[PDB]
Amino acid sequence: TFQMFWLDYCEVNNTLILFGKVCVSAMVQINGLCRELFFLPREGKTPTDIHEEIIPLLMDKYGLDNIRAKPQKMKYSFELPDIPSESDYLKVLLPYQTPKSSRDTIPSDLSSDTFYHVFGGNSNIFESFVIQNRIMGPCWLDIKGASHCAVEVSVDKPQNITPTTTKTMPNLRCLSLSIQTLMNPKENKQEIVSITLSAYRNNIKPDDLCTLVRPPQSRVRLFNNEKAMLSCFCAMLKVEDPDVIIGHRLQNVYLDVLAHRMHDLNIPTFSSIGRRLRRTWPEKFNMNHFFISDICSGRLICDIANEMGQSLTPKCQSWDLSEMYQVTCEKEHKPLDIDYQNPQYQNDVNSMTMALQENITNCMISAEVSYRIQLLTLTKQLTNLAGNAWAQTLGGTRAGRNEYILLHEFSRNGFIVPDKVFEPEKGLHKNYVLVMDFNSLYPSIIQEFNICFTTVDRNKEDIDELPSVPQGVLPRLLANLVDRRREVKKVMKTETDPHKRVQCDIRQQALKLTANSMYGCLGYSRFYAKPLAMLVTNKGREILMNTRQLAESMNLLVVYGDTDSVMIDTGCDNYADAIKIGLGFKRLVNERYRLLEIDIDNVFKKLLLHAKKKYAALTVNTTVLEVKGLDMKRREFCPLSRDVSIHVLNTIEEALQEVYDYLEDIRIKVETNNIRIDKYKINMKLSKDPKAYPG
Amino acid sequence: YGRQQLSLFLKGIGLSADEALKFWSEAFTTMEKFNKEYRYSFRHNYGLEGNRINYKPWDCHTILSKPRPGRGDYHGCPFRDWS
DNA sequence: GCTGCCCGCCT
RNA sequence: AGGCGAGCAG
Numbered sequence: 001t002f003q004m005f006w007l008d009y010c011e012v013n014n015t016l017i018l019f020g021k022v023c024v025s026a027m028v029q030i031n032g033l034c035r036e037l038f039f040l041p042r043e044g045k046t047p048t049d050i051h052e053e054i055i056p057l058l059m060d061k062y063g064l065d066n067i068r069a070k071p072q073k074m075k076y077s078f079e080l081p082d083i084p085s086e087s088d089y090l091k092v093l094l095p096y097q098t099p100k101s102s103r104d105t106i107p108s109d110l111s112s113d114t115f116y117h118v119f120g121g122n123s124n125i126f127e128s129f130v131i132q133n134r135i136m137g138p139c140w141l142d143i144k145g146a147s148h149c150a151v152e153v154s155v156d157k158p159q160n161i162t163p164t165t166t167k168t169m170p171n172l173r174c175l176s177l178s179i180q181t182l183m184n185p186k187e188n189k190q191e192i193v194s195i196t197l198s199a200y201r202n203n204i205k206p207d208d209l210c211t212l213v214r215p216p217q218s219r220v221r222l223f224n225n226e227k228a229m230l231s232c233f234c235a236m237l238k239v240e241d242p243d244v245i246i247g248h249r250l251q252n253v254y255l256d257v258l259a260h261r262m263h264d265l266n267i268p269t270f271s272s273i274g275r276r277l278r279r280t281w282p283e284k285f286n287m288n289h290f291f292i293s294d295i296c297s298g299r300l301i302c303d304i305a306n307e308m309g310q311s312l313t314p315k316c317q318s319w320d321l322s323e324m325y326q327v328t329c330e331k332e333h334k335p336l337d338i339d340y341q342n343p344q345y346q347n348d349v350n351s352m353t354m355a356l357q358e359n360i361t362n363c364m365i366s367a368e369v370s371y372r373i374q375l376l377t378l379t380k381q382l383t384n385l386a387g388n389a390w391a392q393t394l395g396g397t398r399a400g401r402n403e404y405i406l407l408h409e410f411s412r413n414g415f416i417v418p419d420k421v422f423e424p425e426k427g428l429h430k431n432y433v434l435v436m437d438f439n440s441l442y443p444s445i446i447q448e449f450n451i452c453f454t455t456v457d458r459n460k461e462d463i464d465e466l467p468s469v470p471q472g473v474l475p476r477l478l479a480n481l482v483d484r485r486r487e488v489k490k491v492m493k494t495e496t497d498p499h500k501r502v503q504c505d506i507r508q509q510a511l512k513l514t515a516n517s518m519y520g521c522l523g524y525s526r527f528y529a530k531p532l533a534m535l536v537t538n539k540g541r542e543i544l545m546n547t548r549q550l551a552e553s554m555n556l557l558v559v560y561g562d563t564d565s566v567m568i569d570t571g572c573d574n575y576a577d578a579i580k581i582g583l584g585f586k587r588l589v590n591e592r593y594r595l596l597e598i599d600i601d602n603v604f605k606k607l608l609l610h611a612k613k614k615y616a617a618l619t620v621n622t623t624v625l626e627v628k629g630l631d632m633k634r635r636e637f638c639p640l641s642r643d644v645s646i647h648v649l650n651t652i653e654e655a656l657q658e659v660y661d662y663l664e665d666i667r668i669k670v671e672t673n674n675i676r677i678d679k680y681k682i683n684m685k686l687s688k689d690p691k692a693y694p695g
Numbered sequence: 696y697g698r699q700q701l702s703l704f705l706k707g708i709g710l711s712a713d714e715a716l717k718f719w720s721e722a723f724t725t726m727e728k729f730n731k732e733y734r735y736s737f738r739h740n741y742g743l744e745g746n747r748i749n750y751k752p753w754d755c756h757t758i759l760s761k762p763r764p765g766r767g768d769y770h771g772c773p774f775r776d777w778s
Numbered sequence: 779g780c781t782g783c784c785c786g787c788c789t
Numbered sequence: 790a791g792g793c794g795a796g797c798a799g
């Protein structure tokens with residue numbers, strides 16, 4: 001037997017390779033995987049007829065010696081019209097690896113005298129492997145019977161790998177990255193000058209601390225230039241062979257720049273940034289994001305300022321390194337502005353030393369923030385709930401965990417899957433403003449009204465047609481998740497140790513995220529169904545209108561509203577009184593809808609609302625400033641403009657006179673030209689070529 | 696097109712900006728939609744907005760260079776656009 | 779990432 | 790007639 005905790009996967013040469021660790025890293029190449037093709041017989045036809053007709057044709061086309069085909073009975077209740085609910089299908093296991101034309105698919109519309117519909121024609125090898133083997137996220141695999149690992153094995157058939165019940169998960173090889181960048185005004189390419197590498201192999205103290213550096217103008221390792229630096233990086237990265245790579249904004253800036261500088265120098269060992277070995281770059285190097293995501297498959301992208309990471313620190317506003325450290329760790333770090341174009345870095349040793357010190361500080365801070373906010377554990381729970389890629393879970397997808405959960409749950413129940421508002425009160429409110437989140441609005445609607453694919457009779461020909469309300473599959477899954485969350489709350493009531501309390505906090509937040517990402521399945525998506533989405537939207541409209549009436553009855557004025565959150569004005573200037581009123585409103589709403597559990601999300605001592613999603617406020621946590629949607633968030637406005645805006649907001653008759661005084665002396669500064677120029681910078685993207693604009 | 700032709704003509708003959716607002720607002724026998732949509736355009740016409748360009752009136756050449764009038768249009772040179 | 783349409787705003 | 794912001798369907 002072979003025991004291996006898998007972490008990632010990739011697709012090459014019609015083969016599926018799982019990247020995992022055996023604790024040292026290991027490989028398993030999975031050959032013999034078969035797309036599960038399901039053919040729906042005509043009215044009065046049997047899977048034996050489909051077998052007799054298509055199977056010899058499939059042998060002729062694909063040149064096999066034998067094809068496994070059996071009749072199996074399965075359901076269908078999705079949006080494809082005139083497909084009967086229950087019938088007898090013919091399961092043909094067509095392997096991904098075929099002697100001839102392995103890149104040609106069978107269209108879903110193959111109409112024959114035996115069958116008229118085809119399913120699984122474009123199934124994904126990783127998706128099919130995970131669905132058939134029912135693998136719900138990264139866990140143990142029981143394996144029985146080309147890479148940068150020390151252990152490399154393979155299995156001839158997919159059934160040789162069976163998931164294990166064990167809940168433990170061994171030590172990971174972590175690696176934080178923070179890279180100083182240089183811009184060369186000749187080619188406008190971001191050249192790497194120094195890298196700090198820190199490995200947490202198993203305020204935690206790193207096992208090792210390494211810093212490479214190249215001269216920008218003319219342990220710590222010194223190099224003559226960039227190329228030897230980066231080759232040594234690749235070699236020591238293979239030696240380290242980390243399970244997870246950590247950093248700040250690695251997803252769309254830093255790893256992109258690293259890969260581009262990897263190509264520009266033409267290094268051969270650039271495949272050590274992932275775990276899969278390669279000799280040459282993909283031929284065609286939006287698509288670049290996908291290509292580095294593919295090559296790095298095997299090493300785990302842990303971005304802490306990415307979408308998933310930033311979703312865990314809403315108290316951040318720019319999500320910068322010092323700010324995130326300050327908010328998550330309550331520790332002060334002053335960011336040092338290091339620009340290597342300055343001539344002092346070519347001859348002054350002390351400046352280069354301070355730059356390296358700041359780089360090492362940045363790397364330690366990134367790692368500490370990563371471990372503090374517990375991104376890894378939360379994403380692990382999300383993936384084990386969804387059964388998708390945990391690489392995808394960190395990557396920051398929307399249709400990633402809204403599809404594989406439905407795939408797993410419906411395939412475990414023998415279901416054929418289809419192939420792949422109130423106007424705002426604009427102005428300043430003196431009283432406290434409470435943020436209340438209705439993220440559990442639609443899922444409660446689904447579970448309460450039993451809306452699903454198998455319960456709501458909807459005219460499939462006319463998707464614009466609204467059906468009528470009818471236990472469903474989706475409501476049962478949602479109710480099970482909610483009951484798991486209830487058990488989590490009950491154990492929180494009793495638990496003593498902070499550690500397990502925090503773990504259960506992660507667990508409850510994971511269930512809340514999974515349950516509240518369930519509308520992305522049919523609203524936005526491989527499971528889109530307009531009648532259901534529009535129905536639930538209507539019912540949520542009804543619930544929101546009732547909530548408005550209740551708020552008006554409790555002497556409250558709603559300032560702004562949507563299906564995602566409801567803003568309320570308490571009418572008191574006390575934090576305690578506002579909290580009490582918000583709790584009362586939550587209780588009354590939960591009384592009017594027993595499955596709609598709402599809560600207090602954020603508190604605003606002072607709120608200046610400008611539009612639907614454009615506002616600024618004094619968040620109480622201590623009061624902290626917040627802004628969403630004002631001009632001080634766009635690129636086209638200089639840091640001086642943002643500073644003027646932040647001070648104006650902080651000030652807001654004495655406040656207005658102070659605003660006038662500040663405007664006068666900043667004008668006197670500007671006309672005299674007594675303000676540093678970099679405060680006047682304006683940035684703006686072009687999605688097109690510079691020559692290619694009418695205006 | 697008719698609005699622009701007529702506005703720049705009436706500027707060229709010498710109508711004041713305030714009397715221009717007065718007349719244009721009068722001819723539309725709401726004020727809300729006016730202040731919402733037409734006031735800014737009329738003030739832009741007199742160069743009293745934007746880059747501060749007091750746009751010189753269209754001539755018969757430029758007016759003819761405008762796309763041909765249709766139903767609901769009255770701009771152009773009627774020695775052309777009429778029968 | 780690309781197109782059509784609806785509204786809001788500026789030149 | 791054009792650009793900035795969203796929402797929709799492909």
Ligand code: SF4
Binds near residue numbers: 774
């Ligand atoms: S030719 Fe036509 S457009 Fe030109 S001045 Fe005479 S009437 Fe006006």
